[PDB]
Amino acid sequence: PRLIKDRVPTPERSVGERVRDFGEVNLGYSWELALREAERCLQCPVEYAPCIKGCPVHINIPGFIKALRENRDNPSKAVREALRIIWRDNTLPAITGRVCPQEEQCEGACVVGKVGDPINIGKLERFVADYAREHGIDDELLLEEIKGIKRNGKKVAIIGAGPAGLTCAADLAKMGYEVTIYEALHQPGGVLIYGIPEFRLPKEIVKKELENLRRLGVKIETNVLVGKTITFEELREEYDAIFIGTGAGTPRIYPWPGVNLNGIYSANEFLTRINLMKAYKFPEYDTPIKVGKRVAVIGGGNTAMDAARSALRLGAEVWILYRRTRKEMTAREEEIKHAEEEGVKFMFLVTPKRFIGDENGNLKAIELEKMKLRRPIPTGETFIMEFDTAIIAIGQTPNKTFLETVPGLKVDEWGRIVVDENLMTSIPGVFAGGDAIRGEATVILAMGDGRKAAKAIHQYLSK
Amino acid sequence: MMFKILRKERLAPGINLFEIESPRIAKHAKPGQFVMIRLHEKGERIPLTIADVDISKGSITIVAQEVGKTTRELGTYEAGDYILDVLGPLGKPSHIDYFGTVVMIGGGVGVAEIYPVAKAMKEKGNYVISILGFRTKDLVFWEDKLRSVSDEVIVTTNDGSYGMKGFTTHALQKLIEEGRKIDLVHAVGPAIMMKAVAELTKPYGIKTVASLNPIMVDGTGMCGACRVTVGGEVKFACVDGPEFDAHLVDWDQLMNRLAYYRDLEKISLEKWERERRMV
Ligand SMILES: Cc1cc2nc3c(=O)[nH]c(=O)nc-3n(C[C@H](O)[C@H](O)[C@H](O)COP(=O)(O)OP(=O)(O)OC[C@H]3O[C@@H](n4cnc5c(N)ncnc54)[C@H](O)[C@@H]3O)c2cc1C
Ligand SMILES: Cc1cc2nc3c(=O)[nH]c(=O)nc-3n(C[C@H](O)[C@H](O)[C@H](O)COP(=O)(O)OP(=O)(O)OC[C@H]3O[C@@H](n4cnc5c(N)ncnc54)[C@H](O)[C@@H]3O)c2cc1C
Ligand code: SF4
Numbered sequence: 001p002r003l004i005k006d007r008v009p010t011p012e013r014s015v016g017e018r019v020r021d022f023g024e025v026n027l028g029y030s031w032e033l034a035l036r037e038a039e040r041c042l043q044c045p046v047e048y049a050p051c052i053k054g055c056p057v058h059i060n061i062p063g064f065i066k067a068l069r070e071n072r073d074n075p076s077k078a079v080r081e082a083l084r085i086i087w088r089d090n091t092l093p094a095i096t097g098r099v100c101p102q103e104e105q106c107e108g109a110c111v112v113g114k115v116g117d118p119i120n121i122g123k124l125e126r127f128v129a130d131y132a133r134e135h136g137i138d139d140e141l142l143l144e145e146i147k148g149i150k151r152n153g154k155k156v157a158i159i160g161a162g163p164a165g166l167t168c169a170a171d172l173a174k175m176g177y178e179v180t181i182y183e184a185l186h187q188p189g190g191v192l193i194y195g196i197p198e199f200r201l202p203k204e205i206v207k208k209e210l211e212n213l214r215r216l217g218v219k220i221e222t223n224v225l226v227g228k229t230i231t232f233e234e235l236r237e238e239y240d241a242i243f244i245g246t247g248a249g250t251p252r253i254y255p256w257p258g259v260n261l262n263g264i265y266s267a268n269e270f271l272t273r274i275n276l277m278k279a280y281k282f283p284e285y286d287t288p289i290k291v292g293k294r295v296a297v298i299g300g301g302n303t304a305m306d307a308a309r310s311a312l313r314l315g316a317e318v319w320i321l322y323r324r325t326r327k328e329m330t331a332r333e334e335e336i337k338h339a340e341e342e343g344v345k346f347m348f349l350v351t352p353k354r355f356i357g358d359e360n361g362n363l364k365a366i367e368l369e370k371m372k373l374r375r376p377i378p379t380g381e382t383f384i385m386e387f388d389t390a391i392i393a394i395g396q397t398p399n400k401t402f403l404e405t406v407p408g409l410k411v412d413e414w415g416r417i418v419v420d421e422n423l424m425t426s427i428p429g430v431f432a433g434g435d436a437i438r439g440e441a442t443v444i445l446a447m448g449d450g451r452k453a454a455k456a457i458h459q460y461l462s463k
Numbered sequence: 464m465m466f467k468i469l470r471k472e473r474l475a476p477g478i479n480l481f482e483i484e485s486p487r488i489a490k491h492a493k494p495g496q497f498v499m500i501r502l503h504e505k506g507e508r509i510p511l512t513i514a515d516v517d518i519s520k521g522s523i524t525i526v527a528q529e530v531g532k533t534t535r536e537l538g539t540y541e542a543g544d545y546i547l548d549v550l551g552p553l554g555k556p557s558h559i560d561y562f563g564t565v566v567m568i569g570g571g572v573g574v575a576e577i578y579p580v581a582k583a584m585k586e587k588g589n590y591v592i593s594i595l596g597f598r599t600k601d602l603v604f605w606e607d608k609l610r611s612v613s614d615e616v617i618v619t620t621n622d623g624s625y626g627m628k629g630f631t632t633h634a635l636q637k638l639i640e641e642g643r644k645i646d647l648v649h650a651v652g653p654a655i656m657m658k659a660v661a662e663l664t665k666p667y668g669i670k671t672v673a674s675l676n677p678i679m680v681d682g683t684g685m686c687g688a689c690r691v692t693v694g695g696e697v698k699f700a701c702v703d704g705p706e707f708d709a710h711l712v713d714w715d716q717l718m719n720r721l722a723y724y725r726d727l728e729k730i731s732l733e734k735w736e737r738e739r740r741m742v
């Protein structure tokens with residue numbers, strides 16, 4: 001076939017406008033643009049299409065794209081049919097189309113990307129979900145699902161309201177179970193609500209899923225820290241099965257001297273203050289946040305990018321200080337580019353030796369070790385760079401405090417819950433998924449695990 | 464949906480008791496544990512100690528001293544108002560064994576915070592001496608309540624207007640210099656007070672536990688806002704404490720970290736006061 005090699009671009013807000021707020025940067029496709037991009041797809045057979053194999057849950061990508069093309073003159077029918085196909089495998093397309101690292105997944109596998117730009121699969125999936133939400137088409141499909149629910153009288157508890165737990169809960173409700181989600185924070189959503197900022201994941205997208213759960217008859221109990229507020233044994237007595245979706249929410253903090261100086265935040269604290277507590281709107285909102293004139297962000301993943309771009313919106317000059325090379329950064333390529341555009345400065349092959357303070361206990365500088373290349377090793381050369389604020393973003397890990405209290409639960413040396421081929425833990429009737437079993441991973445994997453665990457719970461309770 | 468205020472009691476100027484409906488927290492709470500609260504959708508999360516529980520009513524009791532915007536706004540709440548979010552019980556329970564003679568030291572609102580710990584110590588068979596520290600007579604509260612769970616109570620006021628004149632530490636130093644048997648000191652109060660208690664007992668080798676009061680946000684171990692240095696190691700107070708060996712705590716670091724947001728705290732309080740001037 002002949003290939004149209006350039007992607008149809010998505011519009012984005014200007015840098016000068018968007019660094020003044022936390023609003024979404026990329027405005028997504030319109031119907032006309034999405035249809036044009038869909039037309040670039042070569043419609044590889046489903047039995048071999050490499051994009052499908054690259055999607056961790058194997059969405060029928062050519063199929064939902066074909067649904068757009070075959071309904072060129074009826075966008076509502078096009079979007080309804082496309083979303084029906086996507087929902088066969090993915091509960092969260094408005095989110096994953098925005099946040100998957102597609103270059104490592106569907107788009108990195110697309111044939112057109114070998115000679116040009118791959119099909120913009122994430123933005124097409126996003127468009128389908130967004131258009132559906134704006135026009136009530138998703139509500140139509142959801143009501144169709146709700147009509148088919150036959151209550152079975154059994155109760156399942158979900159621990160944690162991130163993408164794994166939210167997805168598991170919705171699928172169990174569609175199977176007829178009475179589901180309660182227990183969530184420690186005062187709002188559900190997990191990383192979707194406190195971690196990823198509004199400039200790439202608007203809160204309305206998460207709130208829509210909570211509205212869907214309301215319509216599905218799922219109950220959500222916030223301010224419940226399972227292990228303290230309610231014990232695990234109390235849940236086992238009350239519920240027929242349990243799904244653990246507690247994520248990997250503890251910060252990794254290396255024992256650098258000076259790490260407790262004022263002005264040093266974990267990324268989790270910085271992002272929770274910004275995103276969950278709306279500290280960027282202080283004093284309209286009561287939670288404060290403090291950034292100095294120069295901010296260092298330690299790390300190179302999505303967490304680091306989100307912290308850096310949030311700090312830039314608070315007025316700082318911001319540096320990413322990363323211990324490996326540019327090519328090894330794990331953040332989404334699209335967001336690294338956005339950070340560059342917005343003015344984040346980048347330094348590679350450096351890692352902190354210590355943080356240096358002033359008399360009042362405030363951060364003043366970082367002594368940095370230079371690295372060389374296979375793991376990086378220090379060259380022995382060090383230098384001192386002045387900074388007012390630092391944000392540590394070198395990874396997160398599960399909370400061993402919670403895990404050790406769960407009686408009978410087997411956990412590996414990295415804090416990951418051990419599960420079998422059915423996602424069942426060492427405790428019969430207790431299942432787990434998402435970052436709780438993988439360590440830090442992706443939204444699409446957490447969603448996929450929630451669906452797989454819901455099916456396993458149904459099988460377990462039906463036998 | 465939210466957490467009903469069952470009862471409010473003004474214990475002293477600026478010291479407000481709230482009894483809150485929360486059967487889950489009441490069922491599980493142990494002495495030394497705390498809650499995070501948020502008043503309303505624009506609010507911040509703040510930690511407050513569980514000062515009492517009533518399982519028969521499904522309630523917990525918190526006592527909040529007015530020190531800034533959130534606790535001043537809380538002080539205006541009435542019975543039948545609601546606290547939007549209450550998360551608990553948080554932290555490790557106080558470690559209650561038979562030690563011998565336990566000196567419980569509460570400074571200011573810390574007097575409410577020590578009540579459940581003093582009561583548990585007494586129930587375990589300890590001889591309990593409670594030192595209560597107040598700035599002046601009109602701030603004295605819960606003397607009878609602490610006496611009900613103590614063998615001896617010593618009330619101090621900075622200005623000598625009631626009880627013994629001086630600080631908590633003056634009463635403790637007097638006990639030490641009398642040669643009184645003291646097997647454990649527990650201190651709860653302002654960080655400056657807990658530091659002073661720790662520094663007084665260290666040369667005498669008296670085991671001393673302090674309930675630390677660093678900045679908290681989530682209160683569940685996710686973020687390190689509440690971190691402290693204990694015996695040269697970083698700990699998160701909300702999950703590893705909040706009680707620690709007072710002689711191993713970096714007190715100057717804790718006080719530095721507690722001062723960090725002072726300017727913004729003032730801005731927020733001033734906005735709240737400015738916007739309620741007209742009447
Ligand atoms: C800053 C940041 C940016 C990211 N960006 C991306 C991205 O662009 N693309 C991508 O694919 N992935 C990204 N990720 C990773 C992705 O967010 C996670 O893999 C995903 O959120 C995992 O979902 P989960 O539900 O399994 O875990 P979580 O979302 O962490 O679910 C845990 C939730 O349950 C609650 N909970 C936890 N423990 C308990 C308990 N004991 N009792 C009660 N409740 C509890 C908590 O409130 C928490 O919100 C990012 C992660 C971070 C931190
Ligand atoms: C585990 C724990 C238990 C506590 N129990 C009680 C109690 O039973 N009764 C009581 O009156 N107070 C208690 N406190 C202290 C209480 O949290 C603070 O006084 C409160 O947050 C002040 O907030 P504000 O907005 O009213 O004043 P702000 O202006 O916000 O702060 C005033 C002072 O409180 C401290 N502070 C500010 N923000 C926080 C925060 N997020 N967390 C902790 N401290 C902060 C600062 O050091 C500052 O000096 C406790 C603190 C902790 C950590
Ligand atoms: S889910 Fe992530 S991977 Fe699967 S298609 Fe949508 S974007 Fe590509």
Ligand code: SF4
Nearest residue numbers: 041042044051110111
């Ligand atoms: S691979 Fe690229 S082209 Fe072939 S189907 Fe999947 S998307 Fe369309």
Ligand code: FES
Nearest residue numbers: 680682686687701
């Ligand atoms: S306050 Fe977030 S870790 Fe203790």
Ligand SMILES: [Mg+2]
Nearest residue numbers: 531532533728
């Ligand atoms: Mg405050």
